[PDB]
């Protein structure tokens, strides 16, 4: 037991599947219930789950929950599917929620904290989701030289393909054109030939 | 000011790219001090003075206004307008004042 290291508050480590179902929706009680009810299916992200159910829209899953729960309205019903899917996986983001994270956090305005500590904790992490991060994030992987010769061809054909009008359309951001010239490599940081038969048709 | 406060025919628009430095601050350690003095001179003419809303100089050591564009987000949601204008310009409608 390291000094300064302590077991989390109330997180009873010595729990088992043999033990009864915990009576609280938490990160640990749910994934525990997911072990019993679902077996071992532990997806990485939410849309990994959709890939398993083979193309089920959220509102479709929002339907079946509205049946199990007649009290919620429709747009309340869909909210549950996102939760449980985001509870068992990494809670994910959307260009709508990346706006949702702003509206709630901007509404409160400036805090009465001593050094506006929260607002900085908000505004800093805010920048990290902006395109101007994935761009700069790519540069660090570019300077660290983890690409191959096949990628340079792919970056290059991204540069020829953009029109000078798009440059002045991207030089405004001063980051956006880097996202394009490094399009494929920005994602590659995350993630036998059979010729046509050439016979003589005559002989 | 040229663009939206004047007609398209009679407004002179100066382009940014044709400007000396592209019209923005050059990178700091690059241009032999040419650009740094401009913004410095610019800031030296654009720095405020006088007792603001919080009650101190704009250059005070502790009281800092415009924290994360609060005053910027403040005007952005209030809107510099008047109910009296909002009524009148509604009632005028399409017609020109002339």
């Amino acid at each position: 037991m390291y000094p300064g290291e302590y077991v989390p508050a109330g997180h009873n480590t010595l729990s088992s599947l043999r033990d009864e179902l915990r009576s609280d929706l938490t990160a640990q009680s749910l994934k525990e219930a997911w072990m019993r009810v679902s077996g071992g299916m532990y997806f990485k992200s939410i849309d990994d789950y959709y890939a398993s159910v083979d193309g089920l829209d959220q509102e479709q899953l929002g339907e079946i929950v509205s049946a199990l729960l007649p009290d919620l309205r429709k747009y309340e019903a869909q909210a549950l599917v996102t939760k449980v899917l985001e509870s068992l996986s990494k809670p994910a983001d959307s260009p709508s929620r990346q706006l949702s994270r702003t509206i709630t956090a901007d509404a409160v305005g400036l805090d009465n904290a001593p050094g506006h500590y929260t607002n900085f904790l908000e505004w800093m992490g805010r920048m990290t989701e902006t395109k101007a991060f994935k761009t700069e994030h790519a540069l660090f992987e570019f300077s660290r030289r983890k690409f191959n010769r096949e990628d340079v061809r792919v970056m290059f054909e991204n540069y020829n393909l953009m029109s000078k009008a798009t440059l002045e359309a991207d030089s405004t951001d001063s980051y956006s054109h880097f996202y394009t010239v490094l399009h494929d490599f920005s994602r590659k940081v995350a993630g036998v030939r059979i010729d046509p038969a050439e016979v003589d048709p005559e002989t | 000011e040229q663009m939206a406060f004047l007609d398209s025919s009679e407004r002179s628009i100066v382009e940014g790219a044709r400007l000396p430095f592209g019209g923005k601050r050059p990178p700091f350690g690059t241009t032999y001090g040419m650009g740094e003095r401009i913004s410095e001179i610019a800031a030296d003419y654009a720095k405020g003075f006088g007792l603001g809303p919080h009650g101190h100089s704009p250059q005070h050591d502790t009281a800092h206004f415009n924290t994360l564009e609060a005053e910027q987000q403040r005007v952005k949601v209030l809107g510099l307008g008047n109910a009296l204008v909002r009524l009148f310009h509604e009632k005028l409608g399409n017609q020109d004042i002339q």
Binding site: A165 | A4, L6, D7, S8, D96
Partner: peptide, 25 residues
């Protein structure tokens, strides 16, 4: 404003280069 700032025009809504969102459609 009033002093200083169709069906086709609807299609455009949905310099040297912006001419073609007017033209090329």
């Amino acid at each position: 404003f009033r002093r200083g700032d169709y069906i086709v025009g609807l299609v455009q809504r949905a310099n040297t280069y912006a001419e073609y969102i007017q033209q090329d459609v």
